[PDB]
Amino acid sequence: VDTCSLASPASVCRTKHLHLRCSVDFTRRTLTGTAALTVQSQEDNLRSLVLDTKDLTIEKVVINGQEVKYALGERQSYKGSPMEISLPIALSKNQEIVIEISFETSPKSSALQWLTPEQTSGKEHPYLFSQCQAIHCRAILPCQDTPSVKLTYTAEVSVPKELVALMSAIRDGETPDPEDPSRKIYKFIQKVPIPCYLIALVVGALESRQIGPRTLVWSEKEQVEKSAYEFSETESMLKIAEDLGGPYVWGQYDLLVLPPSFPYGGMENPCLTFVTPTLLAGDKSLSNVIAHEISHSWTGNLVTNKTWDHFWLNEGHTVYLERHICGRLFGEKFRHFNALGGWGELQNSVKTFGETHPFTKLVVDLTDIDPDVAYSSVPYEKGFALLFYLEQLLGGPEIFLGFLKAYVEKFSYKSITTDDWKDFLYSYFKDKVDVLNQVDWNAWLYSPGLPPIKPNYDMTLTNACIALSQRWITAKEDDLNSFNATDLKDLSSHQLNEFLAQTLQRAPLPLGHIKRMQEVYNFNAINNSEIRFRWLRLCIQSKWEDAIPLALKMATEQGRMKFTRPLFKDLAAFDKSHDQAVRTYQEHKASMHPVTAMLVGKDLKV
Numbered sequence: 064v065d066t067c068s069l070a071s072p073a074s075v076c077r078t079k080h081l082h083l084r085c086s087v088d089f090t091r092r093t094l095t096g097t098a099a100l101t102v103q104s105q106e107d108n109l110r111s112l113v114l115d116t117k118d119l120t121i122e123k124v125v126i127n128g129q130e131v132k133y134a135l136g137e138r139q140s141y142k143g144s145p146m147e148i149s150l151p152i153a154l155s156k157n158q159e160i161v162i163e164i165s166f167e168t169s170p171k172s173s174a175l176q177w178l179t180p181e182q183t184s185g186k187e188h189p190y191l192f193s194q195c196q197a198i199h200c201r202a203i204l205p206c207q208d209t210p211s212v213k214l215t216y217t218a219e220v221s222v223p224k225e226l227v228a229l230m231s232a233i234r235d236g237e238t239p240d241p242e243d244p245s246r247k248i249y250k251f252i253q254k255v256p257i258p259c260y261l262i263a264l265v266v267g268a269l270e271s272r273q274i275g276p277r278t279l280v281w282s283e284k285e286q287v288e289k290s291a292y293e294f295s296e297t298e299s300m301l302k303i304a305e306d307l308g309g310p311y312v313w314g315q316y317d318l319l320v321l322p323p324s325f326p327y328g329g330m331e332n333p334c335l336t337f338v339t340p341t342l343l344a345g346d347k348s349l350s351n352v353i354a355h356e357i358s359h360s361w362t363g364n365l366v367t368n369k370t371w372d373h374f375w376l377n378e379g380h381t382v383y384l385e386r387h388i389c390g391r392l393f394g395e396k397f398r399h400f401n402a403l404g405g406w407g408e409l410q411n412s413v414k415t416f417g418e419t420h421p422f423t424k425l426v427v428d429l430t431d432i433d434p435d436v437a438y439s440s441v442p443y444e445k446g447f448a449l450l451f452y453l454e455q456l457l458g459g460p461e462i463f464l465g466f467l468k469a470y471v472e473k474f475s476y477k478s479i480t481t482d483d484w485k486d487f488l489y490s491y492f493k494d495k496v497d498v499l500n501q502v503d504w505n506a507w508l509y510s511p512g513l514p515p516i517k518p519n520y521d522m523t524l525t526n527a528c529i530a531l532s533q534r535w536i537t538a539k540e541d542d543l544n545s546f547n548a549t550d551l552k553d554l555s556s557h558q559l560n561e562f563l564a565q566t567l568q569r570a571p572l573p574l575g576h577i578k579r580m581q582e583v584y585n586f587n588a589i590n591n592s593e594i595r596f597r598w599l600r601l602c603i604q605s606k607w608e609d610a611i612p613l614a615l616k617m618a619t620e621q622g623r624m625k626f627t628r629p630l631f632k633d634l635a636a637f638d639k640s641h642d643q644a645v646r647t648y649q650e651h652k653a654s655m656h657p658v659t660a661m662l663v664g665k666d667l668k669v
C-alpha cells in the first residue's frame with residue numbers, strides 16, 4: 064500500500080481513463096475545468112471512494128448527469144487533502160462508472176510554474192509548465208495519485224491563441240475555441256496506460272524542428288537551432304534502446320527544452336521528454352541525460368514502481384540502460400568511466416546524509432516523508448551499483464542484458480515491487496541461484512551506507528583524472544609553477560569534470576592552489592554546466608571571494624536543483640557569502656519553482 068497517497072488503493076477501485084477538459088487562465092494563474100475519471104470497482108457493494116487533491120477548489124461532482132455528495136478532509140501537509148465521493152448507486156466488482164469533477168487549481172500549485180514574459184526567452188509571452196513526479200499530479204486534478212494505477216488519457220486544452228499547448232500524449236489537432244475566439248483548443252490522446260505522475264503540460268510560445276524520423280525538438284525560437292544540434296544523437300540512442308529493451312511503443316519521441324528554472328535534468332514524460340536547457344553545452348557532451356530519458360520509455364514507463372518506496376526500480380535500471388547506450392556509442396571503457404563516476408556520486412550522497420541515514424537505503428520507507436525531501440542520487444547510483452555487481456556476478460553485460468529485456472517484457476504495463484523484481488531475477492537465473500544466494504540481500508536492499516561490495520571497474524579513462532587531482536592535492540607552493548595549460552590537453556570534457564569531482568572530494572584546497580588553477584586552466588571560461596558547477600563549488604568551499612558573484616549568478620540564472628541547491632548551500636556555509644546567499648534567495652523565492660523554493664528554503668534554514 065501507498066503511504067504517499069490518500070486515495071482508495073488499487074484493490075478498492077481503479078482509474079481506467081481520464082478525460083481532461085480545461086482552460087489555462089494566465090491572468091489568474093489557474094487551470095479550470097473538468098476531470099472525467101472512468102473508474103472500475105474492484106469490490107462488491109462499492110458506495111464511496113477517495114481521491115487525492117492538493118490546493119484544488121472543487122466546484123461540483125457529477126455522476127449520471129446529477130451532482131453527488133463529496134467532502135474534502137483536512138490537509139495532511141505535503142500529501143494534500145483527501146476527497147471522498149459518495150456514489151449514487153452501489154457498484155459491483157468490475158462495474159465501471161464515469162465521475163466528472165469540476166475543479167480549479169491554486170496559483171501556488173506545487174505541480175506548476177507560471178512564468179511572466181520577462182522570465183521567458185522571447186520576453187513577449189508568459190509560459191506554463193508542469194512537473195508531476197512524484198506526487199504533484201494531485202495539485203492539478205483530483206486523482207488516485209499513486210503509480211500503482213495506470214490509466215489512458217484524452218485531453219482538450221484551451222489557451223490564448225498565440226500560444227501552443229503540448230502534453231505527454233500524441234498531438235491530436237487544434238481548433239479555435241467556440242466559447243472565446245481569442246483562444247485555441249489543442250487536443251491530445253495517450254493510448255498507452257500510464258501512472259498519473261507521467262501526465263504533463265506545457266503552454267508557451269513554442270516552435271519545433273525535426274531532428275529524426277520520430278523526433279521533433281520543441282522550445283522558444285531562440286533555443287531551437289542550438290537544441291536541434293545538442294540532441295542530434297537522439298534517433299541513434301532510440302535504436303540502441305530498442306535493441307536492448309524491445310520495441311518502442313509510444314509512437315513519437317519528442318523533446319521539449321524548458322526555460323532555465325526546470326527543477327530536473329530531465330522528466331521522461333511519454334512522447335514528450337522535458338529537459339533542462341543546462342544541457343546545451345554546444346558539443347553534445349551532456350547527452351547521457353537524453354540516453355537516460357529515452358531508457359525510461361522501458362524502465363519506469365512500461366515497468367513502473369508500485370510505490371515510491373521502490374523508486375530505485377525506476378532509476379537504477381534506467382541508469383543501467385543509459386550507461387549501456389553510451390557504452391555502445393563510445394565504447395565499454397567509457398561505460399566503466401561513467402559507472403565509476405556514479406560510484407563517486409554515491410560516496411558523496413552517503414557522506415552528505417550520514418552513513419546510517421534512512422535515505423541511504425535502496426528501498427526506503429516514505430511513511431510521513433515528503434518524496435521531494437527524500438530525493439537524491441541513492442536510488443540512481445546504489446540502484447545502478449547493485450545491477451552492475453549482479454552483471455559481473457552472473458556472467459557479463461550480454462547475459463545480464465538478456466535478463467533486462469526479459470524483465471521489461473515480463474512487467475510491461477504493470478506496477479511492481481522490489482520483491483516482484485527479485486522473484487523474477489531468481490526465476491530468470493534459475494540455473495544461477497547458488498550464485499544469487501551469495502548476494503547479501505538484506506544489506507544491498509535494506510541497509511544504509513555504501514553497498515557491502517564494490518563492483519570491478521576498468522580504470523583506463525579515470526587514471527589521468529586521479530593522477531592530476533593527486534598532483535594538486537599534494538602540491539605545495541613551490542609546485543604551483545609546474546602546473547600548466549598542457550596538463551589538460553589530452554583530457555576530454557568528461558575527464559575534466561571527473562578531475563574536478565576528484566578534487567572536490569578533498570575540498571577545501573588552499574586558496575593559493577585554486578587561484579593557480581584559474582591562472583593555468585581558465586576554468587572560469589567553461590560554460591559546460593557540470594564542469595562550471597563543480598568548479599564553482601571547489602572555489603566557494605576553498606573560500607575564494609572572487610567566486611561569490613559567479614556562484615550566486617549560476618545558482619539563480621538557472622534552477623536545476625542538482626546545481627542550485629548545492630550552490631546555495633555552499634554560499635550559506637561560506638561566512639563571506641552567507642548573508643548575500645540568504646538575501647538572494649528571499650528576493651528570488653517568489654519567482655522560483657515552488658518545489659525548488661521549498662527545498663532551498665529548507666537547505667538554508669529560512
Ligand SMILES: NCc1ccc(-c2cccs2)s1
Pocket residue numbers: 196197327329330331371374434435438
Ligand atoms: N524522473 C525524473 C524525476 C523528477 C522528480 C522525481 C522524484 C521522484 C521521487 C520524489 S521527486 S524523478
Ligand SMILES: [Yb+3]
Pocket residue numbers: 539541542
Ligand atoms: Yb617543495
Ligand SMILES: [Zn+2]
Pocket residue numbers: 355359377378381
Ligand atoms: Zn530517471
